[PDB]
Design a protein around this ligand. Structure first.
Ligand SMILES: CC(C)(COP(=O)(O)OP(=O)(O)OC[C@H]1O[C@@H](n2cnc3c(N)ncnc32)[C@H](O)[C@@H]1OP(=O)(O)O)[C@@H](O)C(=O)NCCC(=O)NCCS
Length: 252
C-alpha cells in the first residue's frame, strides 16, 4: 500500500495514514512545524551524511531528529511524490534583514507544487517563518500564526521570484528561480552551508520549533521563548542545554 517513507512519515507527524490531497497540505505543514525541529546539530557535531530519501527517513523520522531547510524540504518532497503530487525542488537565497545583505547563494531549498493549473510554494524549512499553507504564485496573502506571506514574480540579483513576509512592512524573505534541482545539487548546498565562511549555520548550534503560542529557539548560550506575544531570552549552562533539547524539542 503506502511506502515505508509514507508509513514512517505519518507516524512521526502523528497523522493517521490516509490519502493526502491538496486540502491536506495545511495539516502536513502544521504538524511538521510543531514536531520536526529546525536544527544544525549534525553540522555542530561533525556527523553530516549526504542527503538521500533513506538517510532522511533514518534521521528525521526514525531517530526522531530535526534538520535544516534542505533536509526538511527534501523529505517533504519525497513524501509528496509518494502521495502523487506534481512537485520539484528549487534553490533559494535568503535575505539577512539585520545586516541588509543576501545570505550565501542558494542556501535554501524549497518545493514548487503544480495543482489544478496553479503553482504554489511549499516551504517547511524557513525555521520560524513558516507559512503553514501552500503560498500561491497568484500572489494572494497567506497568514498563519508566524506572520503573513506572499509570492511575487520580481527579478532580483538572486532570482526571478521572491517570497515576501511581515508580522508590519513587507520585506523579502528569500529569492528563488524555477530551475529544478537534484540530489547532487542539494548535497552541494549542504556542503556550502557546512563550509562557507558566511554560512549562518556553521557558527553555533541552533534548534527551533513552533509551539501553540509561538516558537522556541535554543543555542549553546541562550534559550529564547516567544510566548503569547512575549519574547524572552535566558542565558543557559551546559546541563540546561541537554535538558531543554530533550524536554522541549524531543531530541535525545
Ligand atoms: C532561527 C530563528 C527562529 C531565531 O530567531 P528567534 O527564535 O525569533 O529568536 P532570536 O532572533 O532572538 O535568535 C535566537 C538565537 O538564534 C540565533 N540564530 C539566528 N539565526 C541563526 C542561524 N541562521 N544560524 C544559527 N543561529 C542563528 C541567534 O544568534 C540567537 O542566538 P542567541 O540567543 O545565543 O544570541 C530565526 O532567525 C529564523 O527563523 N531564521 C530563519 C533561518 C533560515 O533562513 N532558514 C532557511 C535556510 S536553512
Amino acid at each position: 500500500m503506502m511506502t515505508n517513507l509514507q508509513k514512517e512519515f505519518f507516524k512521526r507527524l502523528k497523522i493517521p495514514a490516509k490519502e493526502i490531497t491538496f486540502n491536506d497540505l495545511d495539516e502536513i505543514l502544521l504538524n511538521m512545524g510543531m514536531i520536526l525541529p529546525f536544527e544544525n546539530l549534525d553540522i555542530m557535531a561533525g556527523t553530516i551524511k549526504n542527503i538521500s530519501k533513506n538517510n532522511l527517513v533514518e534521521k528525521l523520522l526514525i531517530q526522531k531528529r530535526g534538520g535544516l531547510c534542505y533536509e526538511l524540504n527534501s523529505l517533504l518532497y519525497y513524501f509528496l511524490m509518494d502521495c502523487g503530487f506534481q512537485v520539484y525542488k528549487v534553490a533559494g537565497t535568503v535575505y539577512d534583514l539585520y545586516d541588509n545583505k543576501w545570505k550565501p547563494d542558494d542556501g535554501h531549498v524549497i518545493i514548487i507544487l503544480h495543482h489544478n493549473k496553479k503553482d504554489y510554494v511549499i516551504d517547511a524549512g524557513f525555521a520560524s517563518h513558516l507559512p503553514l499553507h501552500p503560498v500561491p504564485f497568484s500572489g494572494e496573502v497567506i497568514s498563519s500564526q508566524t506572520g503573513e506571506y506572499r509570492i511575487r514574480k520580481r527579478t532580483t540579483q538572486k532570482g526571478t521570484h521572491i517570497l515576501e513576509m511581515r508580522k508590519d512592512e513587507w520585506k523579502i524573505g528569500y529569492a528563488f528561480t524555477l530551475d529544478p534541482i537534484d540530489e547532487q545539487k542539494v548535497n552541494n548546498i549542504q556542503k556550502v552551508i557546512v563550509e562557507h565562511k558566511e554560512s549562518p549555520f556553521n557558527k553555533g548550534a541552533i534548534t527551533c520549533k513552533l509551539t501553540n503560542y509561538g516558537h522556541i529557539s535554543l543555542t549553546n548560550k541562550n534559550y529564547t521563548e516567544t510566548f503569547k506575544g512575549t519574547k524572552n531570552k535566558r542565558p543557559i549552562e551546559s546541563k540546561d542545554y541537554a535538558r531543554i533539547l530533550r524536554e522541549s524539542f524531543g531530541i535525545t
